[PDB]
């Protein structure tokens, strides 16, 4: 007829308040014959013998609830873990009250741990409420604590599942280092300014000093931190105008103890109304039998619904967290904490105080500034991308064409040869041609600067297994684009269904098919329907560029596996290698686009194309995902389609013959 409650509490005044709450718990519950005893223990500066003393004292006491209520501990470990593990050996609920670590959220590790405080990842949902208010989509994540970093990434993907957007940059590294400013500058070069930080006080002060020295706290830079990042020297190193969070009664222990007493008391009076009552045995000596109503009492604690307390509607979810939590939103106005918002369990309301930002006006700074210098990457296409070495030092010889058109070149940067050939030789040379004039037309239509560089290899990019952990990766232009080093691929991109699933496409500027390059008895082949090419031999030598989209289009064709097995022994690096090889009469056929070989037939009369025209497709501009550089650029491309500028580009290279 007795119920024992164990507690690890230090101060005698709060012990007296705890005993007073135990005494007042039996007030409104009638004259029932249940009794409530409480046993509180102090704290030795160690942790092993503390765990020993507490575990054998609570075995000898046979308690039902175990409480740890020590915020101001000098050790920064904050580990009530061993007593919770010892109670989880017999499945006894330990109600943690102080820490908010995400390692306690794993119920597979902490089998019988409950708590009335949520982890900080729920604050990101509050920050998602910022996304419900300030209408901001692209974020920049920075988490140093990797024990909670996977849970923060999980919660972030759970929040972004609704809008189906993507985080622009995520970062995880070892806490303790200092040279993280390179990734800060890489995030600075991005369009967004939203900064989400999840670390301890030392790394927060380190990144505050790094933003202060590099002036990343100017206009438009969105800063959004929590309670751990506004304490200690991080509060001293914080810039003025930063927005932070505050836990209402997060450190106020006296009402929190009474709330915990009310929760435990109503849980015990709920459990007394049901059958199958079991008791914890004397597990110190000769008792390893588990307490059989562990998950039963846990299920009692799952449906615990309350209506008493100064905090309010305390309620457990499936994770045993805190529902309907009042939060405060603070601002740092001239090294002074100024309250600028309140938060109920679903909605943010700013108070009568104004919101003064570190940049300009008091309204929200739209920190989504698009890149005025679009990084352009391309492959060396032979009739389209002419690359010429410089004359004296980084210069371009301004030669004139035969039609009175001056060639407007650009200073591009490119490697010299392949990686076994050239170890490291990347020089700036002169790029011009077809798509360069297309980019000149785009820069004439819309005012934006650019940065033309070249892809490191001579491949488009295929979907290949990386050599560890069985993961798909891309390479080439797609590998340089998806890594964030490139912005817009201006190249004759072969449009297919696979790449449409991953990135968005624009309107095609080129429209052509496929053809066969031969040299001039049947000297022609007339397409794929030659039966000798269905079952080839060592005579008809035909191949294509290694890691090309033509090979992917043939890989989708499940009835031409013989050509896929035949052409893999003769794939070349570039198409010019195939031109030189068939120039020496070593090749016999080559599947390639139409107008390139038409221009090369206009250059060299021995180069002969075939008669058929299959795979009538289009080539456009390689693009990113949903972006404001899509609609206006596509309208500019269609404006180039409707006028005679396509005919002008034909007059430059296509219509011009010899």
């Amino acid at each position: 007829k007795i119920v024992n409650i164990g507690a690890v509490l230090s101060t005698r005044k709060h012990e007296q308040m705890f005993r007073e709450a135990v005494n007042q718990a039996n007030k409104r519950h009638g004259s029932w014959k249940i009794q409530l005893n409480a046993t509180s223990v102090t704290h030795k500066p160690n942790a092993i013998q503390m765990a020993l003393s507490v575990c054998e004292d609570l075995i000898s006491s046979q308690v039902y609830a175990i409480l740890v209520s020590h915020p101001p501990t000098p050790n920064d470990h904050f580990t009530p873990t061993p007593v919770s593990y010892t109670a989880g050996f017999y499945r006894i609920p330990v109600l943690g009250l102080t820490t908010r670590m995400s390692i306690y959220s794993d119920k597979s590790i902490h089998l019988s741990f409950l708590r009335t405080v949520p982890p900080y990842s729920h604050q990101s949902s509050v920050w998602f409420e910022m996304m419900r208010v300030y209408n901001w989509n692209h974020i920049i994540l920075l988490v140093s604590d990797d024990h909670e970093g996977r849970a923060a990434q999980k919660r972030l993907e759970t929040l972004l599942e609704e809008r189906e957007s993507k985080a622009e940059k995520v970062l995880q590294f070892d806490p303790g280092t200092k040279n993280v400013t390179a990734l800060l500058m890489e995030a600075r070069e991005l369009e967004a300014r939203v900064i989400i930080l999840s670390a301890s006080e030392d790394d927060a002060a380190t990144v505050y000093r790094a933003a202060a020295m590099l002036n990343m706290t100017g206009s438009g830079y969105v800063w959004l931190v929590g309670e751990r990042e506004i304490s200690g020297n991080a509060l001293r190193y914080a810039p003025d105008g930063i927005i932070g969070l505050q836990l209402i009664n997060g450190k106020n222990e006296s009402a929190h103890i009474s709330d915990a007493v009310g929760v435990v008391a109503q849980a015990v009076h709920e459990l007394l109304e049901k059958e199958n009552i079991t008791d914890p045995p004397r597990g110190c000596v000769g008792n390893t039998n588990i307490w059989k109503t562990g998950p039963l009492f846990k299920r009692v604690l799952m449906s615990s619904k309350y209506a008493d307390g100064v905090t309010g509607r305390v309620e457990f979810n499936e994770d045993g967290d805190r529902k309907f939590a009042n939060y405060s939103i603070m601002n740092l106005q001239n090294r002074k904490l100024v309250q600028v918002g309140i938060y109920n369990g679903t909605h943010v309301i700013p108070n009568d105080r104004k919101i003064i930002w570190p940049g300009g006006e008091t309204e929200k700074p739209r920190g989504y500034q698009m890149s005025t210098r679009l990084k352009i990457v391309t492959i060396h296409q032979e009739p389209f991308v002419y690359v010429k070495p410089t004359m004296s030092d980084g210069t371009c010889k301004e030669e004139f064409t035969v039609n009175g058109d001056p060639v407007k070149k650009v200073i591009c940067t490119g490697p010299n040869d392949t990686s076994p050939g050239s170890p490291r030789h990347t020089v700036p040379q002169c790029c011009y041609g077809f798509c360069i004039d297309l980019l000149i037309k785009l820069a004439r239509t819309m005012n934006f600067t650019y940065e033309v560089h070249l892809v490191a290899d001579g491949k488009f990019g295929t979907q290949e297994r990386v050599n560890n952990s069985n993961k798909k990766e891309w390479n080439g232009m797609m590998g340089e684009l998806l890594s964030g080093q490139a912005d817009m691929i201006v190249a004759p991109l072969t449009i297919n269904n696979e790449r449409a699933q991953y990135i968005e496409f624009s309107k095609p500027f080129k429209y052509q098919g496929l053809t066969i390059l031969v040299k001039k008895p049947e000297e022609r082949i007339t397409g794929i329907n030659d039966p000798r090419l269905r079952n080839p031999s060592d005579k008809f030598i035909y191949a294509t560029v290694k890691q090309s989209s033509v090979d992917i289009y043939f890989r989708r064709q499940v009835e031409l596996s013989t050509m896929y097995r035949h052409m893999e022994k003769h794939n070349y690096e570039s198409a010019a290698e195939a031109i030189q090889a068939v120039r020496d009469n070593k090749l016999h056929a080559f599947i390639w686009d139409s107008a390139v070989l038409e221009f090369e037939a206009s250059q060299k009369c021995d180069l002969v194309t075939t008669g058929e025209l299959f795979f009538r497709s289009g080539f456009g501009i390689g693009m990113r995902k949903d972006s404001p550089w899509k609609q206006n650029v596509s309208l500019s491309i269609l404006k180039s389609h409707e006028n005679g500028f396509m005919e002008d580009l034909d007059k430059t290279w296509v219509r011009y013959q010899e």
Binding site: D106, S108, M302
Partner: protein, 144 residues
Amino acid sequence: QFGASIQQQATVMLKIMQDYDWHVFSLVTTIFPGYRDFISFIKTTVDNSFVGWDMQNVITLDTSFEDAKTQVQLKKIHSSVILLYCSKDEAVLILSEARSLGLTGYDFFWIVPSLVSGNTELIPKEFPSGLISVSYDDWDYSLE
């Protein structure tokens, strides 16, 4: 520890599914903890495998099933291979509902991990004869 984690075990089970061309499957996840890592590992493995897995959407749970809202999600199942991540006392009720809904047919498969399959002696009669399990408990190599 000298053991085998659930991630490498999921890798082995998806290797089994790749070696059998069992590409049309489903996934039922309960409220047993350590489950979102399992879902995310399945998502990354499907995104990093040459199969292109035809995966039905995840049947999620909230509590012990009322057989009112979980019934609709279980009646969405029409695929053969069924994956599950739960405890044993949950799996008894899951297999009882699956036999009650007829999900234990000859076409339908059931692959469970080693954490739900406990003692070799304690086998309740509600288990389907043909239940696929993967455990590192090798009787050929003793403790010595």
